[PDB]
Structure formats: structure tokens, C-alpha cells
């Protein structure tokens, strides 16, 4: 009726969306290699004839928290965590290359090296890494080199077979896709395998969700949500009062 | 008129020479 009902409704709806965005981070505190999503609000003015008094606010995801996660020491050979900044190249079920930070690796019955989510890990050849089937000792190098020991072979047979593809692009050019894999915003952009990133083998990288940061965002989203609801109530209260004009 | 009053039109800006030049 006054268009301030919808101006406040559109703000209250967006505050719920930001609340859900923060809720996903808290639901994913223990997730491995999880980058917390950032939430903010953007002011978009309604340009047109009349006084510039109506400005909408909509929530967006400007970026992600690319800080180093909490490293968990597991003493497992097939667990690796990226030191500092970096990524691991994996292809999902669609055969589409995407960057990940989950270094919880495993070997299937055929020998292909996958991660906890089943994404095949790429290597120097840019093809999924395949290991000889009857292994005896698998050690992951600090730079990503994979050295294996054939079954029954003596100690002095630690030959390298593959090198984990570690990619360190600009963090501002990466977006989180629909399946948690970060990809270039510009499509058809090759992932250059960096040789500077290092793996801290024997440990797993946790999530970087700042629990306090989400909680203080929640309490501010609640108060701003409630204040706009009062604006909706006072908008209809004014409308009801301004109805006796035609009540002759 | 009042000084410093906001305008109801997009704010001519920098990128896209189009605005930086046309008055």
C-alpha cells in the first residue's frame, strides 16, 4: 500500500537468506578442507522519477575465508594437508576438473588414488593417478611426489610413480561450485600445477569456520530482521488509519 | 535548491569513458 511494506519485507527476506548462509558454516565446522562462506549486504537504489528515498538491500557471497584450516594429526600415510595456500586438483563424477582441499586420500581396488569424497586426484600427466595394484608401502612426498614399494620388494626400491598436482591460483578468481569444488570464474582456464605448494603428510586440514564470527553475525541478523518487521507493522497501521478519508 | 541533495539518477562514474566524458 505504501511500498514501505515491501521495502521492509525485501530486507527481512534477505536477512533470512544471510542467516541460512551462516547456518551452513556452523553445520560444516568439522568438514574437511571446508572454506567458510562470507556474507554481506549490498545497497541497490531504485533509480527513477521522484525523491531518492527507496533503496533495497540484498545479500550476496562476496568471497570465502581462504585461511588455513585446523590441522588434525592422524599419523596416516594417505592423509595430507596443504601447507599455507594451495589446492589439490580433482575431477568429480562429471569428469570436470575442480580444486579441493580435502587430502583424506584412499586407494580403491583398482588402485586409483581418490579422496574421501570419491573425486579422482590428478597428477603430473593431468590424468587421474593410478598406482600398481599389489603395493606394500605408500609414502606421499612433501612436494606431492608419490613413491610406492612393490609387494615383497626390498627396502631400497622406493621408486616414484606420480606427483600430486598442487595448484595455487589467486584466491579472488575462484568460486565455490555446486559440489564444493573451487573453479576459475573465467571458464576454459587451465589450472597450472605449482611446484611451490607443500604437503604436510600425516595430517588432515579441518575447516576454518570462526564460530564466534558466525554467532555475532546471527545476533545482528536477528535484530535487523525484527526491526524491519516492525516497519511492516507500522506500514499497515498507517494504511488502516488513512482509510477514514473515504468513510463519509 | 538544497545543497548536497542526492539525485535520483545513476551516479556518473569512471569506467566506460562514456560517463567520464559526457557532461
Amino acid at each position: 500500500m505504501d511500498r514501505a511494506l515491501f521495502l521492509a519485507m525485501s530486507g527481512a527476506k534477505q536477512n533470512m537468506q544471510a542467516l541460512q548462509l551462516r547456518a551452513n558454516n556452523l553445520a560444516n565446522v568439522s568438514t574437511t578442507g571446508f572454506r567458510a562462506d562470507l556474507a554481506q549486504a549490498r545497497s541497490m537504489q531504485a533509480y527513477g522519477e521522484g525523491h531518492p528515498s527507496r533503496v533495497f538491500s540484498m545479500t550476496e557471497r562476496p568471497g570465502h575465508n581462504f585461511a588455513q584450516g585446523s590441522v588434525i594429526t592422524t599419523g596416516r600415510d594417505l592423509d595430507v594437508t596443504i601447507e599455507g595456500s594451495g589446492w589439490i586438483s580433482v575431477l568429480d563424477h562429471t569428469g570436470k576438473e575442480g580444486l579441493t582441499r580435502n587430502g583424506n586420500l584412499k586407494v580403491d581396488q583398482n588402485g586409483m588414488l581418490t579422496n574421501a569424497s570419491g573425486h579422482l586426484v590428478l597428477g603430473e600427466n593431468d590424468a587421474p593417478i593410478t598406482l600398481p595394484i599389489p603395493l606394500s608401502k605408500i609414502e606421499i612426498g612433501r612436494d606431492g611426489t608419490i613413491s610406492v614399494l612393490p609387494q615383497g620388494a626390498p627396502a631400497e626400491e622406493f621408486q616414484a610413480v606420480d606427483r600430486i598436482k598442487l595448484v595455487k591460483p589467486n584466491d579472488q578468481s575462484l568460486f565455490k561450485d555446486t559440489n564444493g569444488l573451487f573453479r576459475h570464474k573465467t571458464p576454459n582456464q587451465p589450472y597450472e600445477a605449482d611446484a611451490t605448494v607443500s604437503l604436510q603428510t600425516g595430517a588432515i586440514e579441518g575447516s576454518n569456520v570462526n564460530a564466534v564470527g558466525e554467532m555475532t553475525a546471527l545476533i545482528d541478523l536477528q535484530r535487523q530482521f525484527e526491526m524491519q518487521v516492525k516497519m511492516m507493522s507500522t506500514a499497515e497501521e498507517m494504511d488502516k488509519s488513512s482509510d477514514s478519508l473515504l468513510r463519509m | 535548491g538544497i545543497p548536497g541533495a542526492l539525485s535520483n539518477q545513476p551516479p556518473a562514474d569512471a569506467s566506460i569513458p562514456q560517463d567520464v566524458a559526457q557532461m
Partner: protein, 180 residues
């Protein structure tokens, strides 16, 4: 007074737009760099520091801006409607228009290039410099101009604004027309 490292921090938004509207500042730090638009309208600033680099637009309407030092770079436009500037320096990197309406401007540097419109409305300027090239419209309404330079390039329409033109350029490539 002057502008310090922390004085400017209170007048900057998330996109580096410096707003000094009616602020009692008289000068800016030497070698000043502003990421976004700079607004110094209605300010007692008399001279801009040398090496000023603006990533946006300049607005100094109704201000005390009188002197500009050479080497200043402006990505956008320079809006000086109603300032106190008397002379325009040579070598200013300007990517927009130069609005000098209601200014005491008298002289302009030779071979000046303006990438947009040029307004010298109500200015005591006596003669446009030879080699002046304008990529937009020309406003000379209410000015003291009565003689045009021999060669000038106005990509837009020249607006006389009332003053009588006694001499026309010999080499003039005009994309528009001439209006009184």
C-alpha cells in the same frame, strides 16, 4: 588545516571515495593518491599538491580551489563550476570534461586536449589557445571571447551562448553545428 594519514581515513568509504564536502581542510599531502572520486567542493583549499593521482572524478564546485600543480592525473572528469581558479596548468592528465562555468579563468595552455565537453561559461578568458582540440561540445556563453583560434577541433556542437564571433577558424572539423 592539513590532511594527515588518519585525517583522510575518516572520509573514505569501502571503494576509496574521498568526501571533503565543507570540511575545514586547506591542503592535501604531497604526492597524494586517491583510489576513487575526490570531492573538495566548498573547501578553503587554495592549491592541490603536486603529484596528485585520482582514480575517479574531481568535484570542486563553489570552492576556493585556485591553483593546480602540473602532473596531476584524473581518471574521470574535473568539475570546477564556481571555483576560484585563474589559470590552468599544462600537463594535466584528464580523462573527462573540464567544467569551468562561473570561474575567473583567464588563460589556457596551448595545444590543450579535452576528451569531453569544455565549459568556459561566464569566464573572463580572452582567447582560446591555438591547437585546442575538444572531443565534445564547446560552451562559451557569457564569456569575453570574441575571436576564435585559427585551428581548433570540436567534435561536438559549438554553443556561442550570445557572444558575437567576429573571426572563425580556418581549419575546423565540426561534427555538429553552431548555436547562438
Amino acid at each position: 588545516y592539513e590532511l594527515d594519514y588518519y585525517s583522510k581515513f575518516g572520509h573514505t568509504d569501502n571503494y576509496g571515495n574521498l568526501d571533503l564536502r565543507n570540511k575545514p581542510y586547506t591542503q592535501l599531502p604531497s604526492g597524494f593518491v586517491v583510489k576513487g572520486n575526490l570531492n573538495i567542493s566548498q573547501t578553503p583549499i587554495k592549491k592541490l599538491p603536486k603529484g596528485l593521482d585520482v582514480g575517479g572524478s574531481l568535484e570542486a564546485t563553489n570552492s576556493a580551489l585556485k591553483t593546480i600543480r602540473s602532473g596531476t592525473k584524473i581518471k574521470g572528469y574535473a568539475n570546477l563550476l564556481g571555483s576560484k581558479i585563474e589559470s590552468w596548468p599544462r600537463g594535466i592528465k584528464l580523462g573527462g570534461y573540464l567544467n569551468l562555468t562561473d570561474t575567473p579563468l583567464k588563460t589556457l595552455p596551448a595545444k590543450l586536449r579535452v576528451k569531453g565537453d569544455l565549459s568556459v561559461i561566464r569566464t573572463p578568458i580572452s582567447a582560446l589557445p591555438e591547437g585546442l582540440v575538444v572531443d565534445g561540445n564547446l560552451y562559451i556563453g557569457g564569456s569575453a571571447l570574441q575571436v576564435f583560434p585559427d585551428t581548433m577541433t570540436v567534435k561536438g556542437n559549438i554553443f556561442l551562448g550570445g557572444n558575437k564571433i567576429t573571426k572563425w577558424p580556418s581549419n575546423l572539423t565540426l561534427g555538429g553545428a553552431v548555436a547562438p
